[PDB]
Design a protein around this ligand. Structure first.
Ligand SMILES: Nc1ncnc2c1ncn2[C@@H]1O[C@H](COP(=O)(O)OP(=O)(O)O)[C@@H](O)[C@H]1O
Lengths: 73, 291, 72, 145, 73, 72, 73, 73, 72
């Protein structure tokens, strides 16, 4: 999703955030819903970098999850 | 008498070929000229070489030369190496969606995220290997004028092609240029309507495409929806693909469900409701009543 | 045989004991022509294939080469 | 000169190679001729290719005479048939136009609208076909009936 | 050049005498004069001109001209 | 519509659009050869002698929409 | 029989060259090429020679020529 | 041009109808060799030729016309 | 299946055979009109263009089978 995002080297989602995205958004036994989660994260982060980085390493921790995506589903 | 009448008859049918047949050869020569002025790619020059071997007909009824030169009209008329200097500003789109529509401020940002990943492509070429947009709402919502908004917002051009009435894949995959009526679906008709190679092209009411025909035009859409194959998309009528990575397709529906399964892939969903009566007043008083 | 120049025959091998004309227009085989007077008028006439380029590659030659004593 | 160039031969290679060069077949078949290193095998292969091209010659020659004999029989059949179409130019076409004259006299006794008279003249341009008694001319005679 | 196009047209018409049917074909020439003299738009006139010179086919033996009458009328 | 033609001082030619199925006649038919007939519309606006008539499109609910082209 | 049938193929191409005078080699002779050198069994091969011989009627005014072309495809 | 055209039209009579190349235009020969090969009772042959007459009075453009084609097959 | 294909080093393919109901589009349909088409098996077979591919077929559990032949 980051090579597909095209904003490589700048987005850095922590693994606890990844587990929280699993735990909050999508309940499928597949994985494609989580890819869509990470795509929405990548899209909103691409919007955010598009005016400039506040960080060159977007530490996407458990805090900033509904900042790159909708409130926990 | 037979010698004299055959000698004269052949001369008068020869002048008839100078009168009726020669105008067809001359007009087809002019279409060869518009090949040399239009600036084809060399593969599309090879399709023009196929045109050079196809423009040799007295055209009367299902004629090869007329639908062949119609394909030539489409191929010159789908533009070539025009730039459309698209403004690479998400904020330009941000002000356009406000200046042309009221909006909920709940759906504009998804468009802005899409144009953001357009603006942040892994390729230097702008890519669409991510899921592409789909709009669902009332028909009365300004989906096409939002197409105009993303035309002017990205310096592109919007072309009102209502796909929602189109049913047959024979319309969509227009057949071979051997019979007139080998006529493409509305994308090549809108790409006719542009003279720059990267326009705003809208895809309309895929819920309202119910498969009332042999063949699946949703499969043909999947041939133009996946960016790894829109650039390799031909119908029957095309043989060298017009690349549609530059030719952006936004999909847009109204009902959530009767979209075909081969088009539910590469979707990102945008659901728009109607307008509150105050918002109806707002859109009326600043847009519709001034309109 | 060996250390004799090669003229690629133009689309037709020269069968032996036949009065045949051999024509050389390219300068690269003209070099083998000028070397052929240094080969005691005995040219290892190895013919190329049906397609022949202007600079004749030896890989295009056949596996059967005729040798001719030049009359003139 | 290809025939007299292969006459007066002492060596078998003076004859067979000269003949196979002066003969007319493919160049890829030269490789199988020489790769057959036995001269009996080369001679038999060149003889087989000579016989193959000779039989192709009789085939093309008999169909060329078939073309000229069907040209002769279609020419003379058409010549007798244009004696018939010359009588139909002279006597039979006059009888067909006499049928058309009788019905045109019925035109001037009842009285067509002059556009219908014009259409009788128009399919009389489809008629008045002295060149042949066409089935189109028969059906336009039915039309003028 | 114009009188050359004219003279080739009355040699085209002069050979329409003695051949086929002058009735019918003179109807086509007066018809095509009616076709020209109604006031066509210029794109309409030019793409009618190819159809006009294709109506110059003799009506019976080339029956394309026969439907071209019912087209250009 | 006749009163409208009186009012606007225009010609008209009414035409009937019931049970018509083919764009051989809804639209013109393809002129493949002699006898290709384009249908009611082109004759109907051939009967007028002006580029500004009023045209009476009638009983349009009675269509039979099917192949050989569509009425709509 | 083979040296007869080679000449039979040489004259078998001759009807399609008459077709290629008006409706040229562009796709039709290419389908004639995909008849042979694309490897198929002899039942297919004879059927494909039959299918070229299903063609060469007329093409202006018929999708039946087109449907023979596409089944030949 | 017409002389050589007549010569090749005589040659195609001379070489393919005489020998075993092909039976001319094999669309009709296919349409009848599908009849000849099977050995049905002749009532079904008359039904097949009746459907043939139905599919010859029209140019196979009806939706039921292709059902008639494939049903004839 | 793609991993199996590249492990086998023969070409991957997939065709959405899910919901496919028609043997007249899997064994195809004998044609007299422009538009009858052979199988998606046939189409996929062309798309690999190789007699030994690695072709996934998609979602055969939901094989609808009413009309135009059962492709079963
Ligand atoms: N916030 C808004 N939402 C929807 N439409 C709007 C808004 N503001 C202005 N409009 C205008 O209302 C029109 C909606 O009607 P319509 O053009 O029929 O929609 P469409 O054709 O896109 O389905 C649009 O043309 C648009 O210009």
């Amino acid at each position: 999703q980051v090579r597909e995002s095209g904003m490589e080297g700048r987005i850095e989602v922590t693994d606890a955030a990844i587990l929280r995205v699993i735990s909050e958004y999508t309940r499928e036994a597949g994985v494609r819903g989580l890819e869509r989660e990470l795509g929405k994260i990548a899209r909103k982060g691409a919007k955010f970098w598009l005016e400039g980085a506040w960080e060159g390493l977007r530490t996407i921790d458990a805090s900033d999850i509904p900042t790159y995506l909708g409130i926990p589903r | 008498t037979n010698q004299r009448e055959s000698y004269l008859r052949e001369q008068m049918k020869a002048i008839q070929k100078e009168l009726g047949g020669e105008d067809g050869l001359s007009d087809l020569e002019a279409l060869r000229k518009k090949i040399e002025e239009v600036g084809m790619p060399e593969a599309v020059k090879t399709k023009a070489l196929k045109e050079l071997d196809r423009l040799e007909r007295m055209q009367q009824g299902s004629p090869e030369a007329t639908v062949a030169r119609t394909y030539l009209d489409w191929l010159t008329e789908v533009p070539w190496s025009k730039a459309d200097p698209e403004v690479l500003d998400i904020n330009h789109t941000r002000q356009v969606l406000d200046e042309d529509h009221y909006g909920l401020k709940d759906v504009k940002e998804r468009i802005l995220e899409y144009l953001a990943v357009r603006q942040l492509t892994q390729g230097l070429d702008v890519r669409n290997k991510a899921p592409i947009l789909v709009l669902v709402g009332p028909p009365g919502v300004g989906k096409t004028s939002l197409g105009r908004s993303i035309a002017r917002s990205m310096n592109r051009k919007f072309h009102r092609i209502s796909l929602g009435g189109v049913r047959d894949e024979a319309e969509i995959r227009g057949h071979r240029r051997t019979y007139i009526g080998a006529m493409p679906g509305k994308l090549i008709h809108a790409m006719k309507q542009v003279g720059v190679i990267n326009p705003v092209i809208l895809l309309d009411e895929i819920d309202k495409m119910s498969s009332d025909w042999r063949g699946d035009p949703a499969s043909a859409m999947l041939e133009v929806l996946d960016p790894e194959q829109n650039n390799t998309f031909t119908d029957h009528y095309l043989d060298v693909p017009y690349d549609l990575s530059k030719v952006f397709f936004i999909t847009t529906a109204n009902t959530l469900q009767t979209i075909p399964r081969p088009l539910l892939d590469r979707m990102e969903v945008i659901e728009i409701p109607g307008y509150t009566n105050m918002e109806k007043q707002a859109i009326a008083r600043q847009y519709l009543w001034p309109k | 045989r060996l250390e004799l120049p090669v003229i690629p025959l133009r689309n037709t091998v020269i069968l032996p004991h036949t009065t045949t004309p051999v024509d050389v227009g390219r300068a690269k085989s003209k070099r083998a022509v000028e070397e052929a007077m240094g080969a005691d008028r005995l040219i290892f006439l190895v013919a190329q294939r049906d397609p022949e380029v202007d600079d004749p590659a030896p890989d295009d030659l056949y596996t059967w080469g005729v040798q001719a004593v030049v009359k003139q | 000169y290809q025939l007299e160039a292969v006459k007066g031969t002492s060596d078998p290679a003076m004859l067979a190679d000269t003949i196979a060069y002066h003969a007319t077949w493919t160049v890829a078949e030269k490789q199988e001729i020489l790769e057959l290193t036995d001269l009996e095998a080369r001679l038999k292969k060149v003889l087989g290719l000579l016989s193959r091209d000779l039989e192709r010659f009789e085939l093309d020659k008999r169909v060329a005479q078939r073309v000229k004999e069907q040209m002769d029989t279609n020419q003379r059949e058409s010549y007798l048939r244009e004696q018939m179409k010359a009588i139909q130019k002279e006597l039979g076409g006059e009888d067909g136009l006499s049928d058309l004259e009788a019905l045109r006299k019925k035109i001037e006794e009842v009285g067509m609208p002059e556009a219908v008279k014009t259409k009788a003249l128009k399919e009389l341009d489809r008629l008045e076909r002295m060149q042949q008694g066409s089935p189109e001319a028969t059906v336009a005679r039915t039309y003028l009936d």
